[PDB]
A paper describes a structure:
We report biochemical properties and crystal structures of the LD-carboxypeptidases LdcB from Streptococcus pneumoniae, Bacillus anthracis, and Bacillus subtilis. The enzymes are active against bacterial cell wall tetrapeptides and adopt a zinc-carboxypeptidase fold characteristic of the LAS superfamily. LD-carboxypeptidases subsequently hydrolyze the L-Lys[A2pm]—D-Ala bond to release the tripeptide. The LdcB enzymes are single domain proteins comprising two subdomains separated by a V-shaped cleft.
Residue numbers in the entry:
A (entry chain A): 55 to 141, 150 to 243
B (entry chain B): -2 to 0, 55 to 141, 150 to 243
Write the structure that this text describes.
């Protein structure tokens, strides 16, 4: 239990993770996924996986069907991905939130389960925006906050931070702002 | 003209110069019985009937040689392409109407050895190399072969196969692009 293993840890362009960093409590959440089988991207840290299950349940109660697309991604994966674009998700290895195991990309069939801006205009994307905090999630890179987060709007990308999500949502803040960074 | 002639033909040529009608969606779209890299039935699950049955034959020929291919994305409508283009301007270069995926004759394929991704790395796999040399056996061509950018308008896409039927073998053997084969 160190600073970067905190559920409230900030990982961004400025603040990176150790290169060997892999959470030790990875599990696959019991939710529908946009691909079949088990892959490393199926996993989240246990607390975040349980919260994702809760989130999908709450969505279902209101007729909203979400699908999980991509969770954990290792340092090594990020390295290869950074190269493939050195020729936005141009995060250097060790600087992607996905390596924390606290972040899941989610989408919906109405958006072809793809991670695109169109997801924002679906009832599912709209619901996610206003309800993610009910399960301790925030939309990590909200619209208009590019200069702060370093990322263009990603309506599909949710980060588990626990109880502070509700305050962050209510105050319309980024994680950076909440943490005085 | 900027409009593809014989737009519904199995041998139609659709590229940056020649576009499809904006309201064109093939009427014989079906889901080929093959493994996919994604779950569920979506627009990209489909190919025109003749191309779908050809893809099945292709995957079966592959399997007999221990080659496991996965289908990644087939049909893409004009309307889908329109938002993808807009949200990438604010290769993914194809303007709406000018992607071959709208014909229903085109399937992006990959393999687990390339993590089912549509990248150059597919070319370095046993599966990608097999596909390069065998696609024509089921009526498919590698639409954007290496070095032909000046003609096709696209960099090497080892993952992107286009069904054209019988002429594939000739196109393959002669090392020609579809544009050249059709005098376009
Ligand atoms: Cl992402
Ligand atoms: Cl493509
Ligand atoms: Zn993400
Ligand atoms: Zn393609």
């Amino acid at each position: 239990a160190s600073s970067f293993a905190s559920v409230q840890a900030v990982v961004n362009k400025e603040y990176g993770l150790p290169e060997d960093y892999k959470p030790e409590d990875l599990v696959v959440p019991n939710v529908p996924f946009s691909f079949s089988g088990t892959l490393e991207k199926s996993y989240l840290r246990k607390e975040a996986a349980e919260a994702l299950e809760r989130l999908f349940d709450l969505a279902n109660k209101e007729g909203i069907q979400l699908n999980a697309v991509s969770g954990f991604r290792s340092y090594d994966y990020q390295k290869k991905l950074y190269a493939n674009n050195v020729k936005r998700f141009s995060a250097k290895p060790g600087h992607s939130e996905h390596q924390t195991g606290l972040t899941m990309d989610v989408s919906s069939k109405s958006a072809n389960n793809e991670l695109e801006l169109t997801f924002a205009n679906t009832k599912e994307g709209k619901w996610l925006k206003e309800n993610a905090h009910r399960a301790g999630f925030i939309i990590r890179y909200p619209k208009g906050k590019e200069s702060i987060t370093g990322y263009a709007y990603e309506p599909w990308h949710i980060r588990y931070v626990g109880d502070i999500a509700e305050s962050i949502y209510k105050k319309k803040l980024t994680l950076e702002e909440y943490m005085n960074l």
